[PDB]
Amino acid sequence: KTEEGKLVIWINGDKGYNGLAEVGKKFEKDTGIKVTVEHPDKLEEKFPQVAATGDGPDIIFWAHDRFGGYAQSGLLAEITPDKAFQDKLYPFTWDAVRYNGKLIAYPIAVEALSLIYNKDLLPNPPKTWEEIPALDKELKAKGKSALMFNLQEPYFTWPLIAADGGYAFKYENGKYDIKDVGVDNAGAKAGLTFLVDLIKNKHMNADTDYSIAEAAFNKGETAMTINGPWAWSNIDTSKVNYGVTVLPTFKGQPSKPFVGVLSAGINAASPNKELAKEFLENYLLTDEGLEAVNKDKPLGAVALKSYEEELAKDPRIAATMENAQKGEIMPNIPQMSAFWYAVRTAVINAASGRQTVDEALKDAQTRITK
């Protein structure tokens, strides 16, 4: 039974330079509230090493997948809810942030992507995706392109082959089956086959690099750029208007890309539970500290119906809200990491010239399981 008067924060994508700067000093100002502002970068690998000691600090924000799903085995204490829940909380948010009937994680950051569109240099029916690829005919017909992006990255092919009906793993409620995979079907096959025609009908050789494709996204002068809140290079007070819209449908069904929520939590050794719940409930959960990090400057939407209700002005929470309703939550299984060996042999190997999608993709399923 020991008590202390200090807490260390850990943020990796919150930013808030001036925001947290004030709130931190304002508390100690009373007569006993000192918070240490720290931010990680590569500590992701040190965690399992520096954790074996018992977790020094006790304040860190990270997505819910590797927070409420991994901590459940390491050393993370559950959180207690207040009246903000009964008040009017989005059931679609907490209903998914449950594990073994326990709430050992809370979301306080939405990370995801938008579909970029060009001011008015792309007239067409945004009801069909196929309308996009054809845009190259009229665009290239002069000396430009309506779309430009990578081709061998897990940010385009996957989201493109997902709008067909190709599942990855069997996840119900909050657990997996054993060998239930939805890749050895007609949905995944037809999706991997279409992606190949695009590369041949566009580059006809696939010679697009990062510096080559970066040229387009850099000047965003083409109706195809994919970016997120945590992938912007150099802010700079620009003066160019950009259009943010959500992806259409394919064949009749949308695609399943990435949705992200940051779960907050403390180690199963936090001092004073009542003092923690009180300090945190009024720290990063009120106009006192919240406005600091989410009002100094808007960037991420919060899990509050009351706040978002005025939030109608910000297009971050609104635009992403479209895909969120019809999207899939990131994975939380270690076996899924094996798929990396699949995508390389499926697209890369098959794109070489001595690998057929039949034996490459189909046989790949049986290999992963055995």
PDB file of N, CA, C and O in Angstrom, residues 147-194:
ATOM      1  N   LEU A 147      -5.645   9.825 -61.303  1.00  0.00           N
ATOM      2  CA  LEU A 147      -5.356   8.996 -60.160  1.00  0.00           C
ATOM      3  C   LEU A 147      -3.913   8.494 -60.200  1.00  0.00           C
ATOM      4  O   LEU A 147      -3.404   8.127 -61.259  1.00  0.00           O
ATOM      5  N   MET A 148      -3.266   8.476 -59.040  1.00  0.00           N
ATOM      6  CA  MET A 148      -1.887   8.016 -58.935  1.00  0.00           C
ATOM      7  C   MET A 148      -1.579   7.552 -57.517  1.00  0.00           C
ATOM      8  O   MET A 148      -1.769   8.297 -56.557  1.00  0.00           O
ATOM      9  N   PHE A 149      -1.091   6.324 -57.393  1.00  0.00           N
ATOM     10  CA  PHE A 149      -0.746   5.773 -56.089  1.00  0.00           C
ATOM     11  C   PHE A 149       0.087   4.508 -56.229  1.00  0.00           C
ATOM     12  O   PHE A 149       0.372   4.058 -57.339  1.00  0.00           O
ATOM     13  N   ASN A 150       0.489   3.947 -55.093  1.00  0.00           N
ATOM     14  CA  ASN A 150       1.304   2.739 -55.078  1.00  0.00           C
ATOM     15  C   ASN A 150       0.604   1.591 -55.802  1.00  0.00           C
ATOM     16  O   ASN A 150      -0.478   1.764 -56.365  1.00  0.00           O
ATOM     17  N   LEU A 151       1.233   0.420 -55.784  1.00  0.00           N
ATOM     18  CA  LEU A 151       0.668  -0.756 -56.440  1.00  0.00           C
ATOM     19  C   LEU A 151       1.017  -2.063 -55.712  1.00  0.00           C
ATOM     20  O   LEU A 151       0.306  -3.057 -55.852  1.00  0.00           O
ATOM     21  N   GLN A 152       2.105  -2.065 -54.936  1.00  0.00           N
ATOM     22  CA  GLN A 152       2.507  -3.265 -54.212  1.00  0.00           C
ATOM     23  C   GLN A 152       2.542  -3.012 -52.707  1.00  0.00           C
ATOM     24  O   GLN A 152       3.421  -3.509 -52.005  1.00  0.00           O
ATOM     25  N   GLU A 153       1.580  -2.226 -52.220  1.00  0.00           N
ATOM     26  CA  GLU A 153       1.501  -1.904 -50.797  1.00  0.00           C
ATOM     27  C   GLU A 153       0.167  -2.362 -50.204  1.00  0.00           C
ATOM     28  O   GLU A 153      -0.839  -2.434 -50.909  1.00  0.00           O
ATOM     29  N   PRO A 154       0.137  -2.677 -48.891  1.00  0.00           N
ATOM     30  CA  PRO A 154      -1.082  -3.130 -48.217  1.00  0.00           C
ATOM     31  C   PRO A 154      -2.020  -1.978 -47.865  1.00  0.00           C
ATOM     32  O   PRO A 154      -2.616  -1.957 -46.786  1.00  0.00           O
ATOM     33  N   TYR A 155      -2.152  -1.027 -48.786  1.00  0.00           N
ATOM     34  CA  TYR A 155      -3.019   0.125 -48.583  1.00  0.00           C
ATOM     35  C   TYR A 155      -3.968   0.315 -49.771  1.00  0.00           C
ATOM     36  O   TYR A 155      -4.922   1.083 -49.679  1.00  0.00           O
ATOM     37  N   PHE A 156      -3.682  -0.345 -50.899  1.00  0.00           N
ATOM     38  CA  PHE A 156      -4.508  -0.197 -52.101  1.00  0.00           C
ATOM     39  C   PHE A 156      -5.081  -1.531 -52.571  1.00  0.00           C
ATOM     40  O   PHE A 156      -6.291  -1.681 -52.717  1.00  0.00           O
ATOM     41  N   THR A 157      -4.205  -2.496 -52.819  1.00  0.00           N
ATOM     42  CA  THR A 157      -4.631  -3.812 -53.279  1.00  0.00           C
ATOM     43  C   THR A 157      -5.654  -4.430 -52.327  1.00  0.00           C
ATOM     44  O   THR A 157      -6.722  -4.879 -52.748  1.00  0.00           O
ATOM     45  N   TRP A 158      -5.316  -4.444 -51.042  1.00  0.00           N
ATOM     46  CA  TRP A 158      -6.191  -4.996 -50.016  1.00  0.00           C
ATOM     47  C   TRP A 158      -7.564  -4.320 -50.031  1.00  0.00           C
ATOM     48  O   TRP A 158      -8.590  -4.991 -50.115  1.00  0.00           O
ATOM     49  N   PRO A 159      -7.605  -2.980 -49.949  1.00  0.00           N
ATOM     50  CA  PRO A 159      -8.866  -2.228 -49.956  1.00  0.00           C
ATOM     51  C   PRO A 159      -9.604  -2.344 -51.288  1.00  0.00           C
ATOM     52  O   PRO A 159     -10.792  -2.037 -51.380  1.00  0.00           O
ATOM     53  N   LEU A 160      -8.889  -2.792 -52.316  1.00  0.00           N
ATOM     54  CA  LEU A 160      -9.472  -2.958 -53.643  1.00  0.00           C
ATOM     55  C   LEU A 160     -10.065  -4.354 -53.796  1.00  0.00           C
ATOM     56  O   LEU A 160     -11.128  -4.529 -54.391  1.00  0.00           O
ATOM     57  N   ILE A 161      -9.370  -5.342 -53.248  1.00  0.00           N
ATOM     58  CA  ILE A 161      -9.823  -6.725 -53.310  1.00  0.00           C
ATOM     59  C   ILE A 161     -10.838  -7.021 -52.207  1.00  0.00           C
ATOM     60  O   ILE A 161     -11.440  -8.094 -52.180  1.00  0.00           O
ATOM     61  N   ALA A 162     -11.031  -6.059 -51.302  1.00  0.00           N
ATOM     62  CA  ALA A 162     -11.977  -6.219 -50.206  1.00  0.00           C
ATOM     63  C   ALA A 162     -13.395  -5.892 -50.658  1.00  0.00           C
ATOM     64  O   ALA A 162     -14.364  -6.438 -50.132  1.00  0.00           O
ATOM     65  N   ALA A 163     -13.514  -5.002 -51.641  1.00  0.00           N
ATOM     66  CA  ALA A 163     -14.823  -4.613 -52.159  1.00  0.00           C
ATOM     67  C   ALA A 163     -15.428  -5.700 -53.055  1.00  0.00           C
ATOM     68  O   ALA A 163     -16.279  -5.418 -53.899  1.00  0.00           O
ATOM     69  N   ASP A 164     -14.992  -6.942 -52.863  1.00  0.00           N
ATOM     70  CA  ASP A 164     -15.499  -8.064 -53.645  1.00  0.00           C
ATOM     71  C   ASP A 164     -16.180  -9.078 -52.731  1.00  0.00           C
ATOM     72  O   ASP A 164     -17.194  -9.675 -53.089  1.00  0.00           O
ATOM     73  N   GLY A 165     -15.611  -9.262 -51.543  1.00  0.00           N
ATOM     74  CA  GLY A 165     -16.169 -10.200 -50.586  1.00  0.00           C
ATOM     75  C   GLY A 165     -15.137 -11.182 -50.063  1.00  0.00           C
ATOM     76  O   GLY A 165     -15.460 -12.336 -49.779  1.00  0.00           O
ATOM     77  N   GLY A 166     -13.894 -10.727 -49.935  1.00  0.00           N
ATOM     78  CA  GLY A 166     -12.835 -11.590 -49.446  1.00  0.00           C
ATOM     79  C   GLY A 166     -12.478 -11.318 -47.997  1.00  0.00           C
ATOM     80  O   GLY A 166     -11.841 -10.313 -47.684  1.00  0.00           O
ATOM     81  N   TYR A 167     -12.889 -12.219 -47.114  1.00  0.00           N
ATOM     82  CA  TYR A 167     -12.613 -12.079 -45.690  1.00  0.00           C
ATOM     83  C   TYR A 167     -11.212 -12.589 -45.364  1.00  0.00           C
ATOM     84  O   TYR A 167     -10.607 -13.315 -46.154  1.00  0.00           O
ATOM     85  N   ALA A 168     -10.699 -12.202 -44.201  1.00  0.00           N
ATOM     86  CA  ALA A 168      -9.367 -12.620 -43.779  1.00  0.00           C
ATOM     87  C   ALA A 168      -9.442 -13.749 -42.755  1.00  0.00           C
ATOM     88  O   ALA A 168      -8.990 -14.866 -43.013  1.00  0.00           O
ATOM     89  N   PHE A 169     -10.018 -13.453 -41.595  1.00  0.00           N
ATOM     90  CA  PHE A 169     -10.157 -14.444 -40.531  1.00  0.00           C
ATOM     91  C   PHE A 169     -11.561 -14.417 -39.936  1.00  0.00           C
ATOM     92  O   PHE A 169     -12.292 -13.439 -40.089  1.00  0.00           O
ATOM     93  N   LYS A 170     -11.929 -15.495 -39.248  1.00  0.00           N
ATOM     94  CA  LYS A 170     -13.244 -15.589 -38.623  1.00  0.00           C
ATOM     95  C   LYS A 170     -13.223 -14.990 -37.219  1.00  0.00           C
ATOM     96  O   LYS A 170     -12.688 -15.590 -36.285  1.00  0.00           O
ATOM     97  N   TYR A 171     -13.805 -13.807 -37.077  1.00  0.00           N
ATOM     98  CA  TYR A 171     -13.855 -13.125 -35.789  1.00  0.00           C
ATOM     99  C   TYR A 171     -15.294 -12.812 -35.388  1.00  0.00           C
ATOM    100  O   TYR A 171     -15.942 -11.961 -35.996  1.00  0.00           O
ATOM    101  N   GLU A 172     -15.784 -13.492 -34.353  1.00  0.00           N
ATOM    102  CA  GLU A 172     -17.143 -13.267 -33.867  1.00  0.00           C
ATOM    103  C   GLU A 172     -17.117 -12.781 -32.415  1.00  0.00           C
ATOM    104  O   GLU A 172     -16.529 -13.421 -31.546  1.00  0.00           O
ATOM    105  N   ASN A 173     -17.753 -11.638 -32.168  1.00  0.00           N
ATOM    106  CA  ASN A 173     -17.804 -11.049 -30.829  1.00  0.00           C
ATOM    107  C   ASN A 173     -16.423 -10.594 -30.377  1.00  0.00           C
ATOM    108  O   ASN A 173     -16.150  -9.395 -30.296  1.00  0.00           O
ATOM    109  N   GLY A 174     -15.554 -11.556 -30.084  1.00  0.00           N
ATOM    110  CA  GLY A 174     -14.217 -11.221 -29.648  1.00  0.00           C
ATOM    111  C   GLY A 174     -13.303 -12.419 -29.540  1.00  0.00           C
ATOM    112  O   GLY A 174     -12.515 -12.525 -28.600  1.00  0.00           O
ATOM    113  N   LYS A 175     -13.406 -13.323 -30.506  1.00  0.00           N
ATOM    114  CA  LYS A 175     -12.582 -14.521 -30.517  1.00  0.00           C
ATOM    115  C   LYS A 175     -12.572 -15.168 -31.899  1.00  0.00           C
ATOM    116  O   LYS A 175     -13.460 -14.926 -32.716  1.00  0.00           O
ATOM    117  N   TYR A 176     -11.564 -15.996 -32.148  1.00  0.00           N
ATOM    118  CA  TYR A 176     -11.436 -16.686 -33.427  1.00  0.00           C
ATOM    119  C   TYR A 176     -11.822 -18.154 -33.295  1.00  0.00           C
ATOM    120  O   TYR A 176     -11.893 -18.689 -32.189  1.00  0.00           O
ATOM    121  N   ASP A 177     -12.070 -18.800 -34.428  1.00  0.00           N
ATOM    122  CA  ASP A 177     -12.449 -20.207 -34.431  1.00  0.00           C
ATOM    123  C   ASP A 177     -11.221 -21.106 -34.293  1.00  0.00           C
ATOM    124  O   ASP A 177     -10.943 -21.619 -33.210  1.00  0.00           O
ATOM    125  N   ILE A 178     -10.491 -21.293 -35.391  1.00  0.00           N
ATOM    126  CA  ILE A 178      -9.298 -22.132 -35.378  1.00  0.00           C
ATOM    127  C   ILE A 178      -8.628 -22.160 -36.753  1.00  0.00           C
ATOM    128  O   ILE A 178      -7.432 -21.900 -36.876  1.00  0.00           O
ATOM    129  N   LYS A 179      -9.411 -22.465 -37.784  1.00  0.00           N
ATOM    130  CA  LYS A 179      -8.899 -22.520 -39.148  1.00  0.00           C
ATOM    131  C   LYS A 179      -9.936 -21.983 -40.121  1.00  0.00           C
ATOM    132  O   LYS A 179     -10.041 -22.445 -41.256  1.00  0.00           O
ATOM    133  N   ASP A 180     -10.709 -21.007 -39.664  1.00  0.00           N
ATOM    134  CA  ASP A 180     -11.748 -20.410 -40.487  1.00  0.00           C
ATOM    135  C   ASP A 180     -11.217 -19.207 -41.268  1.00  0.00           C
ATOM    136  O   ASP A 180     -11.026 -18.124 -40.710  1.00  0.00           O
ATOM    137  N   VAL A 181     -10.986 -19.406 -42.560  1.00  0.00           N
ATOM    138  CA  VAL A 181     -10.480 -18.344 -43.424  1.00  0.00           C
ATOM    139  C   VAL A 181     -11.392 -18.123 -44.626  1.00  0.00           C
ATOM    140  O   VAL A 181     -11.888 -19.078 -45.226  1.00  0.00           O
ATOM    141  N   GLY A 182     -11.610 -16.856 -44.973  1.00  0.00           N
ATOM    142  CA  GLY A 182     -12.463 -16.531 -46.103  1.00  0.00           C
ATOM    143  C   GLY A 182     -11.682 -16.000 -47.292  1.00  0.00           C
ATOM    144  O   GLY A 182     -12.084 -15.020 -47.920  1.00  0.00           O
ATOM    145  N   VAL A 183     -10.567 -16.651 -47.603  1.00  0.00           N
ATOM    146  CA  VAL A 183      -9.730 -16.243 -48.724  1.00  0.00           C
ATOM    147  C   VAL A 183      -9.831 -17.246 -49.871  1.00  0.00           C
ATOM    148  O   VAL A 183      -9.732 -16.881 -51.042  1.00  0.00           O
ATOM    149  N   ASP A 184     -10.035 -18.512 -49.524  1.00  0.00           N
ATOM    150  CA  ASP A 184     -10.155 -19.570 -50.521  1.00  0.00           C
ATOM    151  C   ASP A 184     -11.566 -19.612 -51.104  1.00  0.00           C
ATOM    152  O   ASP A 184     -12.209 -20.663 -51.123  1.00  0.00           O
ATOM    153  N   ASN A 185     -12.044 -18.462 -51.575  1.00  0.00           N
ATOM    154  CA  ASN A 185     -13.377 -18.367 -52.156  1.00  0.00           C
ATOM    155  C   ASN A 185     -13.337 -17.651 -53.504  1.00  0.00           C
ATOM    156  O   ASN A 185     -12.263 -17.332 -54.013  1.00  0.00           O
ATOM    157  N   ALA A 186     -14.515 -17.402 -54.078  1.00  0.00           N
ATOM    158  CA  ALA A 186     -14.613 -16.726 -55.366  1.00  0.00           C
ATOM    159  C   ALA A 186     -14.447 -15.215 -55.220  1.00  0.00           C
ATOM    160  O   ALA A 186     -14.081 -14.524 -56.170  1.00  0.00           O
ATOM    161  N   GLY A 187     -14.734 -14.705 -54.029  1.00  0.00           N
ATOM    162  CA  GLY A 187     -14.623 -13.278 -53.785  1.00  0.00           C
ATOM    163  C   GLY A 187     -13.189 -12.786 -53.769  1.00  0.00           C
ATOM    164  O   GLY A 187     -12.885 -11.725 -54.312  1.00  0.00           O
ATOM    165  N   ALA A 188     -12.307 -13.551 -53.138  1.00  0.00           N
ATOM    166  CA  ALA A 188     -10.899 -13.182 -53.047  1.00  0.00           C
ATOM    167  C   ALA A 188     -10.177 -13.432 -54.368  1.00  0.00           C
ATOM    168  O   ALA A 188      -9.274 -12.688 -54.748  1.00  0.00           O
ATOM    169  N   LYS A 189     -10.578 -14.488 -55.064  1.00  0.00           N
ATOM    170  CA  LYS A 189      -9.963 -14.836 -56.342  1.00  0.00           C
ATOM    171  C   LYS A 189     -10.249 -13.772 -57.399  1.00  0.00           C
ATOM    172  O   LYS A 189      -9.335 -13.281 -58.060  1.00  0.00           O
ATOM    173  N   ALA A 190     -11.524 -13.422 -57.554  1.00  0.00           N
ATOM    174  CA  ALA A 190     -11.936 -12.424 -58.529  1.00  0.00           C
ATOM    175  C   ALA A 190     -11.336 -11.061 -58.208  1.00  0.00           C
ATOM    176  O   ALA A 190     -11.182 -10.217 -59.088  1.00  0.00           O
ATOM    177  N   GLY A 191     -11.002 -10.852 -56.944  1.00  0.00           N
ATOM    178  CA  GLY A 191     -10.427  -9.588 -56.539  1.00  0.00           C
ATOM    179  C   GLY A 191      -8.954  -9.479 -56.882  1.00  0.00           C
ATOM    180  O   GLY A 191      -8.483  -8.420 -57.296  1.00  0.00           O
ATOM    181  N   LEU A 192      -8.225 -10.577 -56.714  1.00  0.00           N
ATOM    182  CA  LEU A 192      -6.800 -10.602 -57.009  1.00  0.00           C
ATOM    183  C   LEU A 192      -6.559 -10.622 -58.515  1.00  0.00           C
ATOM    184  O   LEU A 192      -5.497 -10.226 -58.982  1.00  0.00           O
ATOM    185  N   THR A 193      -7.556 -11.091 -59.266  1.00  0.00           N
ATOM    186  CA  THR A 193      -7.450 -11.168 -60.720  1.00  0.00           C
ATOM    187  C   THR A 193      -7.655  -9.801 -61.367  1.00  0.00           C
ATOM    188  O   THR A 193      -7.012  -9.473 -62.364  1.00  0.00           O
ATOM    189  N   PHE A 194      -8.559  -9.010 -60.798  1.00  0.00           N
ATOM    190  CA  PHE A 194      -8.848  -7.683 -61.328  1.00  0.00           C
ATOM    191  C   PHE A 194      -7.682  -6.729 -61.088  1.00  0.00           C
ATOM    192  O   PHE A 194      -7.364  -5.897 -61.938  1.00  0.00           O
TER     193      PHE A 194
END
